Amino acid sequence: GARSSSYSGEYGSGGGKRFSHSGNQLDGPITALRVRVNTYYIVGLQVRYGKVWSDYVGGRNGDLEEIFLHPGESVIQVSGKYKWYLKKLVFVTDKGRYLSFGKDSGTSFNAVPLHPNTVLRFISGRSGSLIDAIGLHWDVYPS
Ligand SMILES: [Cl-]
C-alpha cells in the first residue's frame, strides 16, 4: 500500500521481557537517547519521542550516556554487537554523526531501513537487568 514503515527484526537473545516504543510514536520523532552501559554490556535504554521520555528499560547500575539530537536530525542506520546480551550500539544520523555506545566485541549486526529515505521512528526489544535484544522500526517523519 502507501506505508513506508519497516522493521529490522530482533537482534540478540530471547531472554528477558519484551518492550516496545510503538505507543510513544505519537509523542514525536526521536530527539534524544539514553544508553546505560557497564564494562561489558548495554544495561538500559531510554528514548525521547518529542518531549516525552519512554519508560526506562533495563538495569540501573552503569554509566548513563546520553546524546541529544540536533533539530531535524534523524537516525538512518543502527549497527551493534551482542554476545548473550547487547554489547554495542552505533546510531548513524543523517547529519553524518556516528553515536557509539558500549564495548566493541561480539556478533555484529547492521540495520538499515527497508524503504529508502525513511528514518528510525521507534525501538523495541527485550530487557531484564540488561538489554537482551533490540529491534529497529523505520518510517517517514513527519507523518
Ligand atoms: Cl549470543
Author numbering: 20 to 162
Paper text:
Zymogen granule membrane protein 16 (ZG16) is produced in organs that secrete large quantities of enzymes and other proteins into the digestive tract. ZG16 binds microbial pathogens, and lower ZG16 expression levels correlate with colorectal cancer, but the physiological function of the protein is poorly understood. One prominent attribute of ZG16 is its ability to bind glycans, but other aspects of the protein may also contribute to activity. An intriguing feature of ZG16 is a CXXC motif at the carboxy terminus.
Here, we describe crystal structures and biochemical studies showing that the CXXC motif is on a flexible tail, where it contributes little to structure or stability but is available to engage in redox reactions. ZG16 crystal structures also draw attention to a nonproline cis peptide bond that can isomerize within the protein and to the mobility of glycine‐rich loops in the glycan‐binding site. An understanding of the properties of the ZG16 CXXC motif and the discovery of internal conformational switches extend existing knowledge relating to the glycan‐binding activity of the protein.
